[PDB]
Amino acid sequence: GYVPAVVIGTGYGAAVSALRLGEAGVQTLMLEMGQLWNQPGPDGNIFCGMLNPDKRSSWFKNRTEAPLGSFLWLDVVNRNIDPYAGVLDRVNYDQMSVYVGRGVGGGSLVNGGMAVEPKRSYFEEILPRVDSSEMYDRYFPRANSMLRVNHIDTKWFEDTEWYKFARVSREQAGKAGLGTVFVPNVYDFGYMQREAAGEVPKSALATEVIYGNNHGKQSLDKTYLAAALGTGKVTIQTLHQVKTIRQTKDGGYALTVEQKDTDGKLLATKEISCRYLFLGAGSLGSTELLVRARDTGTLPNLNSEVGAGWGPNGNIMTARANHMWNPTGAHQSSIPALGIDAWDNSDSSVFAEIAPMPAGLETWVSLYLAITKNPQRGTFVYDAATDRAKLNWTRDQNAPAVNAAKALFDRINKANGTIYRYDLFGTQLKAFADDFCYHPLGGCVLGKATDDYGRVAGYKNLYVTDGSLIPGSVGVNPFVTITALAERNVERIIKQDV
Ligand SMILES: Cc1cc2nc3c(=O)[nH]c(=O)nc-3n(C[C@H](O)[C@H](O)[C@H](O)COP(=O)(O)OP(=O)(O)OC[C@H]3O[C@@H](n4cnc5c(N)ncnc54)[C@H](O)[C@@H]3O)c2cc1C
Numbered sequence: 001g002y003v004p005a006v007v008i009g010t011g012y013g014a015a016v017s018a019l020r021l022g023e024a025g026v027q028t029l030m031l032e033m034g035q036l037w038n039q040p041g042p043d044g045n046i047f048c049g050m051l052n053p054d055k056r057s058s059w060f061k062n063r064t065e066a067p068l069g070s071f072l073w074l075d076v077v078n079r080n081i082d083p084y085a086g087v088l089d090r091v092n093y094d095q096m097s098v099y100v101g102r103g104v105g106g107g108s109l110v111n112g113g114m115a116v117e118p119k120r121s122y123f124e125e126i127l128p129r130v131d132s133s134e135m136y137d138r139y140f141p142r143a144n145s146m147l148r149v150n151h152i153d154t155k156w157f158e159d160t161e162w163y164k165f166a167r168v169s170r171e172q173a174g175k176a177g178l179g180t181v182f183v184p185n186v187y188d189f190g191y192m193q194r195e196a197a198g199e200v201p202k203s204a205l206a207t208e209v210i211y212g213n214n215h216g217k218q219s220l221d222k223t224y225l226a227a228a229l230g231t232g233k234v235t236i237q238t239l240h241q242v243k244t245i246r247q248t249k250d251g252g253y254a255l256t257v258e259q260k261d262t263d264g265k266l267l268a269t270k271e272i273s274c275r276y277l278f279l280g281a282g283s284l285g286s287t288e289l290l291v292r293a294r295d296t297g298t299l300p301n302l303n304s305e306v307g308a309g310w311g312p313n314g315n316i317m318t319a320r321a322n323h324m325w326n327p328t329g330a331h332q333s334s335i336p337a338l339g340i341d342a343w344d345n346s347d348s349s350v351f352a353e354i355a356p357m358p359a360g361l362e363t364w365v366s367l368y369l370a371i372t373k374n375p376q377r378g379t380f381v382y383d384a385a386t387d388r389a390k391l392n393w394t395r396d397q398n399a400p401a402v403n404a405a406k407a408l409f410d411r412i413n414k415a416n417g418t419i420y421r422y423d424l425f426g427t428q429l430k431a432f433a434d435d436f437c438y439h440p441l442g443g444c445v446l447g448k449a450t451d452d453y454g455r456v457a458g459y460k461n462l463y464v465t466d467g468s469l470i471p472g473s474v475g476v477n478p479f480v481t482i483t484a485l486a487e488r489n490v491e492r493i494i495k496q497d498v
Pocket of ligand 1: 011103104112114
């Protein structure tokens with residue numbers, strides 16, 4: 001049937017969009033391919049933890065996997081599973097694996113909560129057509145407030161055993177002249193204090209994060225989505241995957257949608273039409289829908305920039321072996337609190353998250369997720385034989401990112417007399433993981449594939465709202481930028497078009 005506005009997905013862009021449409025009085029349907037995560041599972045919990053993965057962990061796989069960095073300790077808990085509509089999807093392309101959330105809330109379900117604004121000078125470099133003053137004065141602060149961003153208590157941080165691993169890295173970086181910064185989060189740090197005291201059920205302190213948090217983490221279902229549902233104007237349909245998009249003869253849109261059950265069985269194929277169509281299926285999901293629509297002839301007026309400009313936010317993982325006298329602790333919070341900020345907009349920039357190790361025993365390992373400035377981009381191309389978008393990206397395109405990361409961590413190794421670990425990421429002796437992405441960005445870049453407010457070129461009433469808009473890099477963990485850009489864009493769209 002017909003609904004005035006449809007939003008595809010329930011991630012950050014989509015959640016912003018639906019809230020503001022509902023507040024404006026526009027009846028809005030959200031379609032989400034994954035589940036609503038609100039039913040206790042066989043252990044009485046909604047989500048599985050990292051030490052007890054089960055079918056809830058994974059989107060349609062037949063075996064659980066250890067989180068990157070932790071194979072040596074966590075492979076022992078892996079098991080065969082039934083393919084199921086689980087929360088974390090590892091999407092494998094030829095030379096890149098991308099990790100995305102699937103469910104009501106999208107990646108907010110599975111992310112580490114780190115809520116960081118990009119440096120203004122870099123924002124200006126990457127999106128020169130956007131007025132940066134309005135972003136920093138108005139839309140970033142709106143995003144932070146709505147997301148429920150909060151700050152750790154620094155006294156507690158200094159004292160607690162749960163953050164020893166971060167203190168050890170801050171000291172080691174300090175020896176090399178590098179500074180650290182506290183990073184705000186959407187996990188409730190007050191709640192975390194109470195976990196540590198044994199006062200409330202543990203989540204961050206019970207090795208939960210990448211398959212969801214049973215407590216503590218203010219994912220989008222608690223914030224934007226709850227507010228959107230509260231307008232009375234927004235409905236969410238789950239286990240509904242949009243496959244195709246076409247323009248009806250009179251300028252509306254019609255979608256073909258598959259309804260599945262949690263075992264992946266096709267129940268129904270539906271057609272939904274609308275006046276206003278907002279894509280929030282993420283960098284991979286929105287880009288695939290649009291490249292399919294262009295190359296199969298259902299949206300023939302899309303431009304040649306659709307599919308282009310993809311980058312993995314310079315994501316590289318590395319690890320250092322500590323001296324025996326510098327243990328990182330058997331108890332490590334799952335929510336990072338500190339980063340190393342060596343980002344000066346030069347080619348050697350790095351912002352590195354100090355990541356926890358989920359092993360629950362002393363490993364002496366310090367793990368980092370580095371964000372680098374690497375100009376290489378990939379392209380999504382449509383494969384008509386398999387009806388999938390394929391990412392044209394090769395491992396050598398990450399060389400600049402590896403070199404930048406290596407230069408930084410070599411400085412820290414030299415100052416402290418430590419070495420890398422080479423055995424954390426599988427078979428090869430490899431100190432730098434260069435074939436994964438947690439922060440996919442691009443494919444439908446703002447100002448190139450769309451206008452400067454995400455209106456897709458060639459079409460009216462067709463909008464993209466999500467990480468596909470960002471040109472491959474933001475220099476920090478990206479969800480606050482996505483959220484703020486969506487706030488900026490939807491405000492304009494609703495005032496001018498709706
Ligand atoms: C392990 C991990 C850790 C991370 N940590 C951080 C962090 O601490 N801070 C940070 O800033 N970022 C982090 N990220 C990245 C962050 O989660 C993403 O950048 C963000 O979620 C992107 O938002 P989005 O709105 O573009 O899309 P997504 O959040 O990816 O949401 C898209 C949604 O659309 C649905 N969908 C897709 N295709 C279709 C379709 N055809 N039909 C219907 N529904 C569809 C999806 O199932 C999903 O729910 C992390 C990501 C991962 C995986």
